[PDB]
Short mmCIF file of C-alpha atoms and ligand atoms in Angstrom, two decimals:
data_model
loop_
_atom_site.label_atom_id
_atom_site.label_comp_id
_atom_site.label_asym_id
_atom_site.label_seq_id
_atom_site.Cartn_x
_atom_site.Cartn_y
_atom_site.Cartn_z
CA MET A 1 83.71 121.67 55.88
CA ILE A 2 84.84 119.64 58.84
CA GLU A 3 81.63 118.83 60.73
CA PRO A 4 81.05 117.80 64.31
CA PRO A 5 79.81 114.20 64.47
CA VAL A 6 76.09 113.82 63.89
CA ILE A 7 74.64 111.26 66.31
CA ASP A 8 72.45 108.46 64.95
CA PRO A 9 70.56 107.07 67.98
CA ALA A 10 69.36 104.04 66.06
CA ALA A 11 72.92 102.78 65.59
CA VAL A 12 73.46 101.45 69.14
CA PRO A 13 75.72 98.37 68.97
CA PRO A 14 74.93 95.00 70.55
CA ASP A 15 75.65 94.64 74.28
CA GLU A 16 78.41 92.05 73.87
CA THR A 17 81.85 91.78 75.39
CA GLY A 18 85.19 90.77 73.78
CA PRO A 19 87.55 92.27 71.17
CA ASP A 20 86.47 93.20 67.60
CA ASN A 21 88.94 90.60 66.36
CA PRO A 22 90.97 87.88 68.10
CA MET A 23 93.78 89.04 70.40
CA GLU A 24 96.71 87.23 72.03
CA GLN A 25 99.03 88.19 74.89
CA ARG A 26 102.58 88.48 73.52
CA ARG A 27 104.22 90.14 76.52
CA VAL A 28 104.58 89.57 80.28
CA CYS A 29 102.56 92.06 82.31
CA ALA A 30 104.12 95.27 83.57
CA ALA A 31 103.83 96.52 87.16
CA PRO A 32 104.11 100.10 88.42
CA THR A 33 106.96 101.21 90.62
CA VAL A 34 108.51 104.16 92.51
CA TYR A 35 111.36 106.62 92.14
CA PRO A 36 114.20 105.85 94.51
CA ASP A 37 113.79 107.63 97.87
CA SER A 38 110.17 108.82 97.32
CA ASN A 39 108.37 109.72 100.52
CA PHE A 40 104.63 109.11 100.24
CA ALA A 41 103.73 110.55 103.67
CA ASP A 42 103.13 113.92 101.95
CA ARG A 43 100.08 114.63 99.85
CA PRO A 44 100.63 114.38 96.05
CA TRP A 45 100.81 117.80 94.34
CA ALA A 46 97.52 117.07 92.55
CA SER A 47 95.65 116.41 95.83
CA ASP A 48 96.93 119.70 97.27
CA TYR A 49 96.18 121.62 94.03
CA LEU A 50 92.61 120.29 93.79
CA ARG A 51 92.02 120.68 97.57
CA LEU A 52 90.77 117.09 97.93
CA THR A 53 90.97 117.20 101.72
CA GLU A 54 88.55 120.14 101.77
CA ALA A 55 86.33 118.68 99.05
CA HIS A 56 85.82 115.54 101.20
CA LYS A 57 84.06 117.60 103.90
CA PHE A 58 81.28 117.91 101.29
CA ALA A 59 81.22 114.50 99.51
CA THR A 60 83.16 111.22 99.18
CA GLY A 61 81.32 109.41 96.35
CA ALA A 62 79.25 107.17 98.67
CA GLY A 63 76.42 105.44 96.78
CA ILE A 64 77.98 106.18 93.34
CA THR A 65 79.42 103.59 90.90
CA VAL A 66 82.09 104.68 88.42
CA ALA A 67 82.86 102.52 85.39
CA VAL A 68 86.46 102.74 84.22
CA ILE A 69 87.21 101.87 80.59
CA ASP A 70 90.99 101.44 80.57
CA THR A 71 93.51 98.50 80.69
CA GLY A 72 91.85 96.50 83.53
CA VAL A 73 92.49 96.63 87.26
CA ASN A 74 94.31 94.35 89.66
CA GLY A 75 92.02 94.76 92.62
CA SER A 76 92.93 95.29 96.26
CA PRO A 77 91.30 96.56 99.38
CA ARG A 78 92.39 100.13 98.50
CA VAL A 79 91.25 99.82 94.88
CA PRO A 80 88.31 97.38 95.36
CA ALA A 81 87.28 97.12 91.72
CA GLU A 82 84.52 94.82 90.42
CA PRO A 83 84.42 92.96 87.08
CA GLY A 84 83.04 95.13 84.26
CA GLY A 85 84.13 92.94 81.33
CA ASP A 86 87.04 92.45 78.94
CA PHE A 87 87.20 93.73 75.38
CA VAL A 88 90.84 92.57 74.81
CA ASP A 89 90.85 89.02 76.10
CA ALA A 90 87.75 87.22 74.99
CA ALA A 91 87.74 85.07 78.18
CA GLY A 92 88.55 87.89 80.64
CA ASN A 93 86.41 89.92 83.06
CA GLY A 94 88.26 93.28 83.45
CA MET A 95 90.05 92.33 86.67
CA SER A 96 93.47 91.83 85.12
CA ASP A 97 95.72 94.83 84.46
CA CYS A 98 98.71 93.88 82.30
CA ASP A 99 99.75 97.52 81.64
CA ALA A 100 100.19 99.14 85.05
CA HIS A 101 97.68 101.70 83.96
CA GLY A 102 94.00 100.96 84.66
CA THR A 103 94.75 100.05 88.24
CA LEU A 104 96.32 103.52 88.68
CA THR A 105 93.45 105.34 86.94
CA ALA A 106 90.92 103.61 89.21
CA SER A 107 93.05 104.55 92.26
CA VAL A 108 92.97 108.26 91.33
CA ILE A 109 89.13 108.19 90.94
CA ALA A 110 88.26 106.12 94.02
CA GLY A 111 91.37 104.90 95.86
CA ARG A 112 90.91 104.47 99.57
CA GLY A 113 93.09 106.19 102.22
CA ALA A 114 95.65 104.56 104.52
CA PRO A 115 97.32 105.83 107.72
CA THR A 116 100.75 105.04 106.28
CA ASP A 117 100.67 107.45 103.29
CA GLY A 118 99.15 110.71 102.07
CA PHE A 119 97.34 109.32 99.03
CA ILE A 120 93.56 109.17 98.61
CA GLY A 121 91.25 109.01 95.61
CA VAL A 122 88.87 111.80 94.72
CA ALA A 123 85.81 109.66 95.53
CA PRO A 124 87.11 107.11 98.03
CA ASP A 125 83.64 105.77 98.83
CA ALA A 126 82.63 105.13 95.20
CA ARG A 127 82.28 101.66 93.67
CA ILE A 128 84.59 100.93 90.70
CA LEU A 129 83.61 98.72 87.73
CA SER A 130 86.62 97.77 85.56
CA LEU A 131 86.25 97.29 81.79
CA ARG A 132 89.41 96.38 79.92
CA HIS A 133 89.36 97.92 76.43
CA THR A 134 93.13 98.33 75.73
CA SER A 135 96.44 96.56 76.39
CA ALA A 136 99.89 97.06 74.93
CA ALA A 137 100.64 93.42 76.01
CA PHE A 138 98.29 91.92 73.38
CA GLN A 139 98.44 91.84 69.60
CA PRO A 140 95.81 91.03 66.94
CA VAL A 141 95.99 87.41 65.82
CA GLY A 142 97.23 87.47 62.22
CA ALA A 143 94.26 88.16 59.95
CA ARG A 144 93.61 88.67 56.22
CA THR A 145 92.43 92.38 56.06
CA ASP A 146 92.28 95.02 53.33
CA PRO A 147 95.07 97.49 54.18
CA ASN A 148 93.75 100.50 52.22
CA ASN A 149 90.40 100.54 54.10
CA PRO A 150 90.08 102.79 57.23
CA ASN A 151 87.29 100.51 58.57
CA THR A 152 89.67 97.52 58.77
CA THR A 153 92.47 99.23 60.69
CA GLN A 154 93.20 98.35 64.34
CA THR A 155 91.88 101.85 65.27
CA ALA A 156 88.56 101.13 63.54
CA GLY A 157 88.30 97.80 65.35
CA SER A 158 89.24 99.42 68.63
CA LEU A 159 86.43 101.99 68.09
CA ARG A 160 83.94 99.21 67.34
CA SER A 161 84.87 97.39 70.64
CA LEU A 162 84.74 100.73 72.48
CA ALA A 163 81.19 101.37 71.32
CA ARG A 164 80.09 98.04 72.80
CA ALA A 165 82.04 98.74 75.98
CA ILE A 166 80.14 102.02 76.48
CA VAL A 167 76.80 100.19 75.98
CA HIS A 168 77.89 97.48 78.41
CA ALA A 169 79.20 100.02 80.97
CA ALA A 170 75.84 101.81 80.90
CA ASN A 171 73.99 98.48 81.33
CA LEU A 172 76.13 97.74 84.44
CA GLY A 173 74.38 100.74 86.10
CA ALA A 174 77.36 103.15 86.49
CA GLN A 175 76.40 106.79 87.02
CA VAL A 176 79.83 108.00 85.84
CA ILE A 177 81.76 106.41 83.01
CA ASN A 178 85.46 107.29 82.74
CA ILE A 179 86.83 106.63 79.23
CA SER A 180 90.62 106.62 79.11
CA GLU A 181 90.58 105.57 75.42
CA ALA A 182 91.50 108.36 73.03
CA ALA A 183 91.68 106.99 69.48
CA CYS A 184 93.22 109.15 66.77
CA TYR A 185 92.85 109.29 63.03
CA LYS A 186 93.24 111.77 60.17
CA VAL A 187 90.20 113.83 59.25
CA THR A 188 90.63 112.86 55.56
CA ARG A 189 90.57 109.14 56.38
CA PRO A 190 87.32 108.94 58.30
CA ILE A 191 86.40 105.74 60.18
CA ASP A 192 82.68 104.85 60.37
CA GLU A 193 82.22 105.11 64.17
CA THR A 194 78.48 105.89 64.19
CA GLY A 195 78.22 103.22 66.87
CA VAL A 196 80.42 105.15 69.26
CA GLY A 197 78.20 108.21 69.01
CA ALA A 198 75.10 106.07 69.46
CA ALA A 199 76.64 104.37 72.53
CA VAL A 200 77.63 107.68 74.14
CA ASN A 201 74.11 108.98 73.50
CA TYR A 202 72.55 105.86 75.05
CA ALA A 203 74.76 106.13 78.16
CA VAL A 204 73.98 109.81 78.64
CA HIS A 205 70.34 110.13 77.53
CA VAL A 206 68.93 106.62 78.17
CA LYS A 207 70.83 105.34 81.24
CA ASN A 208 71.50 108.62 83.13
CA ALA A 209 75.31 108.41 83.09
CA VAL A 210 77.90 111.14 83.02
CA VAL A 211 80.57 110.32 80.47
CA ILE A 212 84.10 111.73 80.85
CA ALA A 213 86.77 111.26 78.11
CA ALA A 214 90.53 111.78 78.00
CA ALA A 215 91.69 114.44 75.55
CA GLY A 216 94.39 111.97 74.40
CA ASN A 217 98.19 112.26 74.25
CA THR A 218 100.33 113.14 71.28
CA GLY A 219 102.52 110.57 69.51
CA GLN A 220 102.13 107.94 66.80
CA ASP A 221 98.72 108.52 65.19
CA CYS A 222 97.94 111.42 67.53
CA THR A 223 99.56 114.46 65.99
CA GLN A 224 98.68 117.80 67.68
CA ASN A 225 95.89 119.86 66.21
CA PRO A 226 96.62 123.50 65.12
CA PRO A 227 94.99 126.33 67.08
CA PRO A 228 91.88 128.22 65.82
CA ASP A 229 92.38 130.89 63.13
CA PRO A 230 91.48 134.26 64.74
CA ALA A 231 90.72 135.67 61.25
CA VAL A 232 87.76 133.24 60.97
CA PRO A 233 85.46 134.49 63.77
CA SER A 234 82.54 132.22 62.76
CA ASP A 235 84.79 129.29 63.88
CA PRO A 236 86.06 130.37 67.40
CA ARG A 237 86.96 126.78 68.38
CA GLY A 238 88.74 126.14 65.03
CA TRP A 239 86.86 123.06 63.77
CA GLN A 240 88.21 123.95 60.29
CA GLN A 241 91.86 123.80 61.51
CA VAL A 242 91.50 120.25 62.81
CA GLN A 243 93.69 117.56 61.28
CA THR A 244 93.41 114.79 63.90
CA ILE A 245 90.07 113.43 65.16
CA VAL A 246 90.25 112.07 68.74
CA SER A 247 87.34 109.75 69.64
CA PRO A 248 85.19 109.64 71.70
CA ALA A 249 86.66 113.03 72.81
CA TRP A 250 85.02 114.73 69.82
CA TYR A 251 81.44 113.89 70.86
CA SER A 252 81.50 116.92 73.22
CA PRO A 253 79.19 118.13 74.81
CA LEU A 254 77.72 114.61 75.08
CA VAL A 255 80.97 113.85 76.81
CA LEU A 256 83.20 116.14 78.89
CA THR A 257 86.67 115.87 77.37
CA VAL A 258 89.56 116.56 79.71
CA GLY A 259 93.00 117.91 78.79
CA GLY A 260 96.12 117.85 81.02
CA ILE A 261 97.99 120.36 83.12
CA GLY A 262 101.26 120.08 84.99
CA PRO A 263 102.31 121.08 88.55
CA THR A 264 103.03 124.66 87.43
CA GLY A 265 99.45 124.99 86.03
CA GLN A 266 100.44 125.04 82.38
CA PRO A 267 98.86 122.90 79.62
CA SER A 268 100.80 119.63 79.33
CA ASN A 269 102.72 119.50 76.03
CA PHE A 270 101.49 116.03 75.21
CA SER A 271 97.79 116.97 75.71
CA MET A 272 95.83 116.69 72.46
CA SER A 273 94.06 120.00 71.71
CA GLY A 274 90.83 120.42 69.82
CA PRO A 275 87.50 122.20 69.48
CA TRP A 276 85.95 119.54 71.79
CA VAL A 277 88.12 119.90 74.94
CA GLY A 278 85.90 121.15 77.85
CA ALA A 279 88.12 121.16 80.94
CA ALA A 280 91.46 120.15 82.38
CA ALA A 281 93.06 118.51 85.40
CA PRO A 282 96.46 117.26 86.67
CA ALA A 283 98.16 114.90 84.21
CA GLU A 284 101.92 114.97 85.08
CA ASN A 285 104.10 113.68 87.97
CA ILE A 286 101.18 111.67 89.25
CA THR A 287 101.06 109.54 92.41
CA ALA A 288 98.65 106.65 92.38
CA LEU A 289 98.23 103.11 93.79
CA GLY A 290 99.44 99.83 92.33
CA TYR A 291 98.27 96.22 92.29
CA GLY A 292 98.50 95.88 96.07
CA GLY A 293 97.10 99.32 96.92
CA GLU A 294 100.69 100.55 97.48
CA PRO A 295 101.65 104.07 96.52
CA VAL A 296 103.41 104.37 93.15
CA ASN A 297 104.88 107.22 91.08
CA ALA A 298 107.00 105.65 88.32
CA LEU A 299 106.70 103.26 85.41
CA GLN A 300 109.30 101.22 83.55
CA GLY A 301 110.27 103.06 80.35
CA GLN A 302 112.70 102.22 77.56
CA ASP A 303 115.87 103.63 79.16
CA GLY A 304 114.66 103.40 82.83
CA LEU A 305 111.99 105.08 84.98
CA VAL A 306 109.44 107.51 83.63
CA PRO A 307 106.77 109.49 85.52
CA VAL A 308 103.14 108.51 85.85
CA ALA A 309 101.48 110.86 83.36
CA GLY A 310 98.77 111.29 80.74
CA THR A 311 95.36 112.71 79.92
CA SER A 312 93.78 109.49 81.29
CA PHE A 313 94.75 110.86 84.77
CA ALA A 314 93.19 114.24 84.03
CA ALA A 315 90.01 112.40 83.08
CA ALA A 316 90.26 110.32 86.27
CA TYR A 317 90.25 113.45 88.48
CA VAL A 318 87.16 114.80 86.65
CA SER A 319 85.31 111.44 86.91
CA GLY A 320 86.01 111.50 90.64
CA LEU A 321 84.61 115.03 90.87
CA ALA A 322 81.53 114.01 88.94
CA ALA A 323 81.02 111.23 91.50
CA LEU A 324 81.37 113.72 94.36
CA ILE A 325 78.81 116.03 92.65
CA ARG A 326 76.26 113.29 91.99
CA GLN A 327 76.41 112.15 95.63
CA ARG A 328 75.93 115.67 97.01
CA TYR A 329 73.35 116.65 94.39
CA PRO A 330 71.65 113.41 93.26
CA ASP A 331 68.85 115.32 91.41
CA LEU A 332 71.32 116.67 88.85
CA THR A 333 71.12 115.33 85.28
CA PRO A 334 74.37 114.45 83.54
CA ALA A 335 74.17 117.71 81.53
CA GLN A 336 73.90 119.68 84.77
CA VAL A 337 76.76 117.78 86.40
CA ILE A 338 79.09 118.56 83.50
CA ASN A 339 77.92 122.16 83.25
CA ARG A 340 78.62 122.60 86.95
CA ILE A 341 82.15 121.23 86.52
CA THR A 342 82.87 123.61 83.59
CA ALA A 343 81.13 126.67 84.98
CA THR A 344 83.25 126.56 88.15
CA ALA A 345 86.59 125.78 86.48
CA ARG A 346 89.46 128.28 86.57
CA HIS A 347 89.27 129.80 83.04
CA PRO A 348 92.38 130.30 80.93
CA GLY A 349 93.56 133.63 79.44
CA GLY A 350 91.32 133.47 76.42
CA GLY A 351 88.20 132.40 78.43
CA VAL A 352 87.91 129.04 76.63
CA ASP A 353 90.62 127.40 74.59
CA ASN A 354 91.41 124.14 72.80
CA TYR A 355 94.03 122.98 75.38
CA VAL A 356 92.05 123.25 78.62
CA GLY A 357 88.55 124.13 77.40
CA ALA A 358 86.82 126.10 80.17
CA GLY A 359 89.90 125.45 82.34
CA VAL A 360 91.19 123.58 85.38
CA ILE A 361 88.53 121.94 87.52
CA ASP A 362 87.91 123.33 91.02
CA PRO A 363 86.30 120.63 93.20
CA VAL A 364 85.48 122.87 96.19
CA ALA A 365 83.89 125.50 93.98
CA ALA A 366 82.00 122.78 92.10
CA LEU A 367 80.69 121.34 95.36
CA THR A 368 79.97 124.67 97.12
CA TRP A 369 80.31 127.92 95.08
CL1 CL B 401 91.03 102.22 77.22
ZN1 ZN B 402 82.88 119.28 54.47
ZN1 ZN B 403 76.70 119.02 56.41
ZN1 ZN B 404 77.39 88.18 75.91
ZN1 ZN B 405 91.10 101.59 74.90
ZN1 ZN B 406 76.60 93.76 78.79
ZN1 ZN B 407 97.32 107.06 80.15
ZN1 ZN B 408 71.88 115.98 76.66
#
């Protein structure tokens, strides 16, 4: 059988920063941008859909610190991130975004308002700690490795550095940890990532942190999982139909794993499905803030502009909501925070499914129902 991961609490990795193996910047850093003639005076569709304006009558994230494990953040008054460490550049501190990504994630979670545009984060009063775990601008320094061994792949190394980043994030004192990383591998080629499970457990059970994970996006090593087989009723979530493990997504319910929807409310076609997905949130045609706290809604692609999109943004909305919840109800354990998010979500046609889990989050219901 395909088995859910079994957590070994004794396997917590050392609290140390830096990459699993040496890394070097090979490309100049990207910056986010805008579609010609965009008007940011209006509220982004995701803000209207999630009723952020209303939700803020009830909570703003004041007193809460969210750690963001992503590509780093270029800080500004509107995205006032603090150093959380670097797991890409051995000399870094998490306050350099070379990918036009982590800055935007952080802005969705906790971006401040401005009178000149309609954008605001979910938890605009929250603190933000930035941990850089990934960058497309860096490459591993040439190394002699065994190419037939899953434990010496870049994915395996990336999961080893992730496990330490989760330990470190927890040690920083964050009460919500947003994990944008969604590492993929084939179920028949298992990586030993016992440390990731132990780190997630430590964050959630030892340091009182809510952990939110991106469902992941298809492409490359992330090939879509098949749906559950209805003829096998003892496996309603279809664990036995899985081909692609997504980590740490698959540690659910230790983590709440978040899939993507678009502006019409449908599951995003790039959103990685699986038995571990618990909820969903907006993940397409996203508006966020850039390196100066300026509104952005486009990125440089291969043949020109592409939209801001991905399950990392879905996870960012949910991390924001968790922050709102923990402010308004500080007595809630991380299990109760998560359960509140899922229990008030708008459930899909089958009640729960592998694309959206319990469904699309509903901030006002979560805060008041
Ligand atoms: Cl990441
Ligand atoms: Zn088996
Ligand atoms: Zn067994
Ligand atoms: Zn150290
Ligand atoms: Zn990463
Ligand atoms: Zn540390
Ligand atoms: Zn992303
Ligand atoms: Zn628990």
